[PDB]
Ligand binder design. Structure first.
Ligand SMILES: *[C@@H]1O[C@H](CO[C@@H]2O[C@@H](C)[C@@H](O)[C@@H](O)[C@@H]2O)[C@@H](O[C@@H]2O[C@H](CO)[C@@H](O)[C@H](O)[C@H]2NC(C)=O)[C@H](O)[C@H]1NC(C)=O
Lengths: 215, 195, 227
């Protein structure tokens, strides 16, 4: 049996309901009248936990806002009032046969726009003593996830020498944070002076630049 | 010929745990999937055999024992278990081969003001042997004084009634229990699953 | 409280074996079936194997039949999963998953998969284990935004994925952002753990990040000083 979830990512404003679809290849209705489909929520940084069992029953501690519906080869999970804690991936599973899962649905919280706080860290002195230089640019608590972060070494746009890392949505702030790390050799680092990190975002009227000179 | 599991599970009236009912089953065929895929059973645990394999096995005899107990006491219908029910009412041996099926029967076996018709043995001199059924109302001597069959001080009636009101917690609610036992003797096997 | 603690996940060469174990507590282990469900990194959920309460019936996913072997020791409240002849697609977190039924392949008494362990990570690579190097992300004029200031730790060059970072030995938790690791071109991982504190606190509060790389027995306490 193949489980398929239509909304792979669902952005939803707080207070506004949400709805997730689940199609299956065979009918999960059984002779005893039950639909052997479950819902599992995987919150950030945790393993999945049971949300709904047998289509319409809540596990222990699950608020009244979560409800399940459907029959046969078509099911739907609904939340009445989405909350910031509801962030996570919601998974289908069928129990009629050996357990098959759906590809999850990420629930994003459509928050008010929040500009990022931009910070830049030069490489530690003990890192340069090992022959490598990491210049970190940090964007803190922004919404939404779409940011454009470019390095500018002596007013020269750098490409191919940076890696980005973004956090999952916060369970209280509904924000993100991003880390752009520039890696050079101690030789290539000392060949230049001005190290600048520009940032473009929807909540920023202009691009914010954080720069520094080596020394 | 199908096995008369209907008249046991769907029996209109169930017995008290001290005087449990045994149905001997032989010379028929059964589809045990109708049991282990039932949506109404709250407890379904099998010992010594896999319930999915039951449909491919043959047995000399099957025994369906049925009675009513409290919810907190269903966990006592198991091998090597201690408690008032396991010790004074219904014991299973360690080599038991069968299944234990329970379901909530609040809507039936509890009345307003209380259904006091289901009993259980509270006092006994010795533990039961496995599959023993003791129904003596012999007065239990809890002192060094002979009771001479007269209820009194340190002289207890051995049977206690259950207080089944619909407002009790699910634990203190009544549960109908069926225990299937699968006997394989060195004689022809006559109870089987389908083909 | 129900607690399913997994262990045994490690870095293993392809073709070799490992013995995953799962210590259970907070419920009658003798009463329920048990399952192994895994999740590849960044991927979906896959059922691996399940075992009855008394090992009476056993199931295996088609991708693991003949290679994996599930067992349980009901006296030691423990579940086992022997992974043999390992390949790269077995690289995943392996979750211990408590069943509601005594038997994994019957429909009666089903009320969902009650509890899931936090998982143990199994990595199938020919790469070798390497302990990380921890470098300060020092607070400075260039890392303040009004009254809030930023500092952190750069954890770099470590191959086995599991890595933990805590601040002031767990006593600092607000404004902490440990970033997802990134696989560098060298085939090593690296990440950063930043914190946001009030500016006035630098030079009054000492900030120390505690990095733990259990695969390499590396525990580092790094003092992040301002410059
Ligand atoms: C116990 O009874 C249920 C319910 O049976 C129905 O109600 C009874 C009063 C009687 O009139 C039956 O004939 C009714 O069908 C049985 O469940 C039904 O079993 C039949 C048999 O094939 C099936 O076609 C129905 O769909 C079932 N309906 C439900 C709701 O379960 C059940 O099988 C009986 N138990 C045993 C062990 O036989």
């Amino acid at each position: 049996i193949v489980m398929t979830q239509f909304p792979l990512s669902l952005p939803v404003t707080p207070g506004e309901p949400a709805s997730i679809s689940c199609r299956s290849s065979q009918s999960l209705l059984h002779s005893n009248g039950n639909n052997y489909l479950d819902w599992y929520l995987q919150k950030p940084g945790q393993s999945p936990q049971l949300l709904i069992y047998l289509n319409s029953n809540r596990a222990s501690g699950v608020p009244d806002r979560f409800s399940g519906s459907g029959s046969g080869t078509d099911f739907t999970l609904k939340i009445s009032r989405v909350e910031a804690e509801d962030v996570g991936v919601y998974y289908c599973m069928q129990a009629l046969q050996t357990p098959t899962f759906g590809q999850g649905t990420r629930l994003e919280i459509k928050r008010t726009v929040a500009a990022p706080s931009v910070f830049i860290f030069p490489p530690s002195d003990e890192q340069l003593k090992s022959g490598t230089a990491s210049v970190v640019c940090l964007l803190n608590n922004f919404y939404p996830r779409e940011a454009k972060v470019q390095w500018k070494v002596d007013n020269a746009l750098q490409s191919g020498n940076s890696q980005e890392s973004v956090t999952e949505q916060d369970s209280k702030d509904s924000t993100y944070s991003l880390s752009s790390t520039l890696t050079l050799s101690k030789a290539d680092y000392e060949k230049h002076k001005v190290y600048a990190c520009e940032v473009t975002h929807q909540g920023l009227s202009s691009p914010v630049t954080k720069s520094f000179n080596r020394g | 010929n199908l096995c008369p599991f209907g008249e046991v599970f769907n029996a209109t009236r169930f017995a008290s745990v001290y005087a449990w009912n045994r149905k001997r089953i032989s010379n028929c065929v059964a589809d045990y999937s109708v049991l282990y895929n039932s949506a109404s059973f709250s407890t379904f645990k099998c010992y010594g055999v896999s319930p999915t394999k039951l449909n491919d096995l043959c047995f000399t005899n099957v025994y369906a024992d049925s009675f009513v107990i409290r919810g907190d006491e269903v966990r006592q219908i198991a091998p090597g278990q201690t408690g008032k029910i396991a010790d004074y009412n219904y014991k299973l041996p360690d080599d038991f081969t069968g299944c234990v099926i329970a379901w909530n029967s609040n809507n039936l076996d509890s009345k307003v003001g209380g259904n006091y018709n289901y009993l259980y043995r509270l006092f006994r001199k010795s533990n039961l042997k496995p599959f023993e059924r003791d129904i003596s109302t012999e007065i239990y001597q809890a002192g060094s004084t002979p009771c001479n069959g007269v209820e009194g001080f340190n002289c207890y009636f051995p049977l206690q009634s259950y207080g089944f009101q619909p407002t009790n917690g699910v634990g203190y609610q009544p549960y109908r229990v069926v225990v299937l036992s699968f006997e394989l003797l060195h004689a022809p096997a006559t109870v089987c699953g389908p083909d | 409280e129900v607690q399913l603690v997994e262990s045994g996940g490690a870095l293993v060469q392809p073709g070799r074996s490992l013995r995953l174990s799962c210590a259970a507590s907070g419920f009658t282990f003798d009463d329920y079936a048990m399952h192994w469900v895994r999740q590849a990194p960044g991927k979906g959920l896959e059922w691996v194997s399940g075992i009855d309460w008394n090992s009476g019936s056993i199931g295996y996913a088609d991708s693991v039949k003949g290679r994996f072997t599930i067992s349980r020791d009901n006296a030691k409240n423990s579940l086992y999963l022997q992974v043999n002849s390992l390949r790269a697609e077995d690289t995943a977190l392996y979750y211990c998953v408590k069943d509601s039924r005594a038997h994994y392949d019957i429909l009666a008494t089903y009320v969902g998969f009650d509890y899931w362990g936090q998982g143990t990570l199994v990595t199938v690579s020919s790469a070798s284990t390497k302990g990380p190097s921890v470098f300060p992300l020092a607070p400075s004029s260039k890392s303040t935004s009004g009254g809030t200031a930023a500092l952190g730790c750069l954890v770099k060059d470590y191959f086995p994925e599991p890595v933990t970072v805590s601040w002031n030995s767990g006593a600092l938790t607000s404004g902490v952002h440990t970033f997802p690791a990134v696989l560098q071109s060298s085939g090593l991982y690296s990440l950063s753990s930043v914190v946001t504190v009030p500016s006035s606190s630098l030079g009054t509060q000492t900030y120390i990040c505690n990095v733990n790389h259990k695969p390499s027995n590396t525990k580092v306490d790094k003092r992040v000083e301002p410059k």
